[PDB]
Amino acid sequence: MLSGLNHLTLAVSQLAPSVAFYQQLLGMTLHARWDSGAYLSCGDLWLCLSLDPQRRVTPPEESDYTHYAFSISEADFASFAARLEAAGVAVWKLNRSEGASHYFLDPDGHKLELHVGSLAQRLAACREQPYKGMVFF
Amino acid sequence: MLSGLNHLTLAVSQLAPSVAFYQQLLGMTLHARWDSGAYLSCGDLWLCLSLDPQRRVTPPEESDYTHYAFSISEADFASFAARLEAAGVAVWKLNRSEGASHYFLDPDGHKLELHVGSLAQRLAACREQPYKGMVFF
Numbered sequence: 001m002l003s004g005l006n007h008l009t010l011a012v013s014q015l016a017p018s019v020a021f022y023q024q025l026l027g028m029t030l031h032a033r034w035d036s037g038a039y040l041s042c043g044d045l046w047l048c049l050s051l052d053p054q055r056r057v058t059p060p061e062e063s064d065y066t067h068y069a070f071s072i073s074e075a076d077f078a079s080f081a082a083r084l085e086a087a088g089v090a091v092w093k094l095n096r097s098e099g100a101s102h103y104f105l106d107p108d109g110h111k112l113e114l115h116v117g118s119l120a121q122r123l124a125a126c127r128e129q130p131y132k133g134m135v136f137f
Numbered sequence: 138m139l140s141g142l143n144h145l146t147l148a149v150s151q152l153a154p155s156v157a158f159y160q161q162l163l164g165m166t167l168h169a170r171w172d173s174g175a176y177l178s179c180g181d182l183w184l185c186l187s188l189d190p191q192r193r194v195t196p197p198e199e200s201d202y203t204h205y206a207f208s209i210s211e212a213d214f215a216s217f218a219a220r221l222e223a224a225g226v227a228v229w230k231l232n233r234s235e236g237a238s239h240y241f242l243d244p245d246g247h248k249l250e251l252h253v254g255s256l257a258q259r260l261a262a263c264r265e266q267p268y269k270g271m272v273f274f
């Protein structure tokens with residue numbers, strides 16, 4: 001059967017600024033770079049940045065809610081979010097509708113998130129503060 | 138410090154067919170559902186389906202290369218691909234890289250992939266046959 005995300009591939013319009021964003025600003029590990037892409041890791045996540053002439057820099061009001069959240073500890077969350085803010089990283093959401101999260105944009109407008117907590121922790125929180133019509137299986 | 142992918146959220150135009158696709162067709166575990174979304178798991182992956190009227194059913198020619206690959210064993214790959222084909226799931230690309238890959242579309246046109254092989258496997262193949270301009274770190 002299926003088990004896990006094997007990799008996340010993001011189409012990027014300009015490879016160098018995107019590599020810099022994920023490696024330098026977000027601290028991911030850069031393993032390889034070539035004329036049309038890069039491979040990075042973030043813990044167990046395999047991230048591929050793929051140069052794509054079709055990628056557009058997309059304002060957040062023009063894209064749907066599809067987004068990619070990265071895990072961070074409770075101890076590190078606030079200072080990492082504040083560092084992104086001070087670096088001028090654009091945002092896309094302010095209301096914490098799914099727990100402790102910071103919502104920010106990559107250079108192409110990919111919707112990213114820092115989040116503290118696992119699925120199990122979110123289900124437990126939702127039992128007390130459920131989303132409308134929520135059912136647990 | 139970021140420690141991995143916390144969750145992947147896909148915006149969906151119709152919640153019921155999307156739940157059917159990820160839970161019943163792809164075999165992911167449904168943990169909760171509410172009026173505007175669902176939480177599923179696939180191995181370590183926390184998947185959120187979020188009902189979003191902004192989501193367009195998007196032909197693959199109209200979206201960029203951003204895509205989401207799920208892990209499957211080599212032994213299970215061909216029968217899972219055949220399951221998707223029996224269900225009528227469209228393919229958006231043929232495999233031309235190392236490691237088995239099946240490139241298929243979700244009901245809203247999200248670009249998905251089944252892939253066999255890790256980052257380490259890809260890096261080893263690339264060391265032997267580097268892509269154009271490839272540098273390792």
Ligand SMILES: COC(=O)COc1cccc(CN)c1
Nearest residue numbers: 016033034035269270271272
């Ligand atoms: C001269 O330009 C650079 O050095 C930019 O950084 C790269 C570093 C590694 C690989 C590539 C792609 N060949 C570019």
Ligand SMILES: [Mn+2]
Nearest residue numbers: 069098113146
């Ligand atoms: Mn999220």
Ligand SMILES: [Mn+2]
Nearest residue numbers: 009204206250
């Ligand atoms: Mn892929």
